[model samples]
Target: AGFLKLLRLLLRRQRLARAMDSFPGPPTHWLFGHALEIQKTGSLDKVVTWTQQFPYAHPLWVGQFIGFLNIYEPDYAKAVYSRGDPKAPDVYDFFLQWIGKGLLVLDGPKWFQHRKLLTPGFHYDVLKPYVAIFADSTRIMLEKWEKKACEGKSFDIFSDVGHMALDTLMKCTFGKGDSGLNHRDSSYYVAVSELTLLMQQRIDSFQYHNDFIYWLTPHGRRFLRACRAAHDHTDRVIRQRKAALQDEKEREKIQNRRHLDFLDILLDVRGESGVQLSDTDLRAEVDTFMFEGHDTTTSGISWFLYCMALYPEHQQRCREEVREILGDQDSFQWEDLAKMTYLTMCMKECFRLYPPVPQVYRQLSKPVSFVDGRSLPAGSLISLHIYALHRNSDVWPDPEVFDPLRFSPENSSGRHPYAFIPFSAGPRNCIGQQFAMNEMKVVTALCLLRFEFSVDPLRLPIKLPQLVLRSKNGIHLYLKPL
Candidate 1:
């Protein structure tokens, strides 16, 4: 349209246009900028190709007005990421609908307050007993896999791993009793899966970014229905728990439980500090925990298994290490966590190859300058591309090769601190990283102890980055009882 051309030129005159002039990138299209090629080529592939072409950082234009300077080098990552910059509003704003303005979306003072309040629940010691709860969930997964394995065919392990993660989260979030997920529980799980897919689809489709137009689309309408389902489920669960806490006997009952979960911390804070956190805040935190805490871990665990299947030597070694640590014990304990050092290194290597949240966003509230003296002014957007960063050949000798020893203590010591950041780095790093790691270790270890995982050579995974990394066709692997 003539009107669109006029407005596009007007918007192009903004600070980012000239500011990114010094940075080089692939040729941009007049209308969609680099966004068109990025979409068609697949984001994961295109970004790596561009980063290899441009070195550490480059201008990544999106649509007419939005632009982000994508950085993947450790030096560039450290310069901006460690500064504790607020998340980029252009992308993160998309999450507000489902997760609300919870910890993931909140900024400044509010973010800090929520971070401070929720920190205790994820303390290594607090998460110690939850290892067993994860084991409880994993055992059920393995039990189910036993039947599936006998089919003598490779199957996608992502869904089972996803369900296992959600089950553990449910148990820990409310300290709920779950022999296993029932029909009601699975309905919520189903909705969460679609909500995740819808959100990723919404972000990828450029025109879908418009609120009015998006709501009118079929996919957008579908998103609303799924979100409604998730919201009501969150409210129903939280409301039931709230009611239980209000009842004197029920309070006495839950208070006697071994570990206090996140919900307990939120409600306990309100009572002791006299802070009136509305139901909106309460539901938001719970919903956030369910999404970030579960979804990210599922990615980590599922990928770890894929790696295990591909590298039988390392998988067998890790299996022996776990049995040595466990001795006669049936499951991993809090103290045994540190002794699974061999397994831990393998897990780190897996994360290096397939980081759970492969890319994250941050916008400058203040000017930032990189180690090479390249700098960007305030209000610029940046994408921390962990996938490219991890795969960079400059840092890791042969980045594509799976080498667990790269994480061994002696070898790991001299590496750049930010070179390998599965949990990310600096002030705003993942809070539940330890929790996520523990759960993955328990689940992966249990799988190794119980089954022999072998991959389907013809069915290898294709990378698909959906906020968190996942497979385009799912990770197909054969499981045989050990």
Candidate 2:
């Protein structure tokens, strides 16, 4: 392959001793490079284990050509994330134009402005009112699952939970308390879901190496159509919300209805430079959230459920803790979520193992040196493999093993702060993390109280590393009576 040859040539000629002071990886093929190797071994657990075999710090190869030069210490790891701020990261430069200047993609002053403007959504007090929305969503799911349990029919808990989470997101994001009425029979969901799957599949395909492949495929063309419709739907919703907000009397009604929707917040926010959001900006940002909010939350909750099925002991412990604290309440209250510490830890551990956005890439804007004294070129993309770091034995005793106790306040305090980054770290961290956490706890606990999960001894590999990491195959788990 051309990439392999290019990598081979680069490897034979370039010395990486200065670039990467320490790494624990194999030699790259001069012709193809490490791209294939890195892509194939997508999981970071193996890399973490290999790194542990080395000294505290040592130069290591990635596939063949590149080097991740840095001490693998927790302090060193956190420093990498803390640097370059999120918006201007070298990795996002290429795609930012297409994605636009949203919080996830922006950096520097603009990123700060958006981050500041949007802070209220996640504020503990501001978010409290949304708990009822989460509780209500769970209640709807509970009724549906209770029926399934009564029928004694086999079901896939992963799929069921995914729908529950997505449905909750729809309600929570838009203050719409039900599923998509207009979209019930629409091919929109089907089309979008298929596009998401194929998009991920193509990332692993050799065709990705060719710039022209995108223009050549029917699937690629169909994907663009789906994206347009998805964006149009999001834009229309934002317009509808903004129209409602413009009416003084309607705004008064919304005060009591008090939807914590992102659009509502965006409507009131202005940038530091006196730049107010236009309808277009508002539409784009809302679209971004809808796309980001729905899929990522769905994948995260589904994986957390899978982890629960995999670790029954952890699940049982979490249930006992929840029962002791919340009792048998018909509905969970705002205060009740705070008491589910075990559920929090279990979800935290789950994200640690399977972060929805496991592999995010960052690029150095200019020649930059690390605290470790290694410097990368201005445009060099440095991948912060959180998946690898999550399983780094140097920081975690049994890195790959599932251990909820690791998150015990005392135990967690003893480790490096960045050791378990499920929702990422630093300023670019997910603003909706607490929101998602509260929602997951409420839903997972509610489901556990009513129905028991049937464990799948072997889980299917449905990994699609798209905009977010996702399962390609639907997660199937049988349900039984609690």
Candidate 3:
């Protein structure tokens, strides 16, 4: 039976490859396909160069047996996202080790159930109080930066902002008010950072693609260690929360509380059938949110700061807007966040240039036909290259230019809704998008209020394709107190 299954898979691959022969992309090897070429040039750089040549949907073969269709054009993105296809199992499986079978990994009815259940956690009313938590966390980060700036040396704000993001996530998501910025070397933070880098490394290293071989290797062993550490932290938090919720009096107290944090809602939520998530599912979700809520937001704010440093004129304009809205306010209000429209535009542009999750993938469970008449087989992986999509000249004029005006109402009118999807679009679009945007606004507003930013000029950061878009070197900025 196993041999027959292998035979069927081989036949299917051959059929798919024959069908994809006319697709425009780099030449592929009969066996290795474009894997070697991609291995030589990084995937992000390779795709960017290819987009210039192909300028639309293109096929990428990992090997003779596995292939993906890379889509960058807004029309293609709209078609694919609108379909709400399941996540590519091949790609998402790699994330499961760290995130587990959470909403990030689940699909079908379970995904829909959890997504619906969690929606209330991010509603405007529920998130309104989070603005205060975000501001408090940002102030702590800014205070730390004050001391660091006085040291007269440029610092990598990525890690600093990452800690701040984690601090905010802890307070807002778990209702833990402890500021995590001070515990730079805490096991949880260190483990999460290690796991992120390790996973990215595995994605880039072809040899680590196979589970058995990867597990046998030294890198795999270290990966296990990192996963263990991260899981340990998440498990402890979930168990403690579970115990607290189990208490009748404590549960009643929680119900009576004026404000419920994200964890509180998760603990109490039930589906239409009166089903609640199991303990394992609960842990998976908390862990998933812990990483997604903090890590991705950190990347957004860090890159936004880098962009501001690179474009001081825009920085000044944003600062003026934030100041005008804030006027004498030491802390930003939910209303103040809405008033930073110019600053919001700047952040959108920043997200376009450097989306935190650079790429997302979906697997075709049924043949998917695009408006262009190009279609892929049921099993083909679809790489929705967000990095390339955002840079598509068809939608974004002078694609490389840093122009915040592109997002302005007049300029953005009549544009494809999917054209500027930093948080993605369609059914599976980020549930926490408003949460993320509010956090970015608060941090950027506060950062501008406290500091002036400028690039090092000589040591400008280099972009890299990671789980989150990251600087190959470090994002260094010259900061001076306002």
Give stretches of model 2 more than 4 Å off.
1-24, 38-73, 86-99, 150-154, 177-213, 246-248, 255-260, 269-274, 366-373, 458-464
lDDT per residue as tens, model 2, 1-482? 77996676466325544444334445556544444544553434445554667533344343343443424455555666667534323234323223345666666786677777676667777667767777776777678778876876555654455555666666666645354335532433455465555554443343433335664688666666766666666666666676766778867765664334566677662322255876656665765676566667777777776777777788788778877776666677888888888888888888877778766655455565555564555444455666666767667787778888888898977677777776777767788888878777877887677655665546554554655666645565556666
Better of 2 and 3 by lDDT: 3
Superposition error at 439 for model 3 (Å): 0.4
Q: Which candidate is the best by TM-score?
A: 1
lDDT, each prediction: 0.83, 0.62, 0.81
Query: Could you tell which candidate, 2 or 3, scores higher by TM-score?
Result: 3
Deviation of model 3 at 384, angstroms: 0.4
lDDT of 1 by residue, 114-154 (tens): 88888878887678878889899999899889999998888
For candidate 3, write residues 1-482 as lDDT tens digits: 76996788778767766667657788877667777766562467678878989867888777666677888998889888878789987678877778889988888899998887777788887788888888888888888899989887887898888878887887787856353544423677888777877877765455576787888899888888988888888877766677867778766776665556678766763323355778888878988998888889888998999899888899999998888887777677887777788999999999998899998889877777777777776767788989999988777789889999998999988888889888889988998899999999998888998999888877788776667887877789989997
Using TM-score as the measure, name the better of candidate 1 and candidate 2: 1
Candidate 3 worst ten-residue window by lDDT = 177-186
Give per-model TM-scores.
Answer: 0.95, 0.82, 0.94
Location of the lowest summed lDDT over 10 successive residues in candidate 2: 90-99
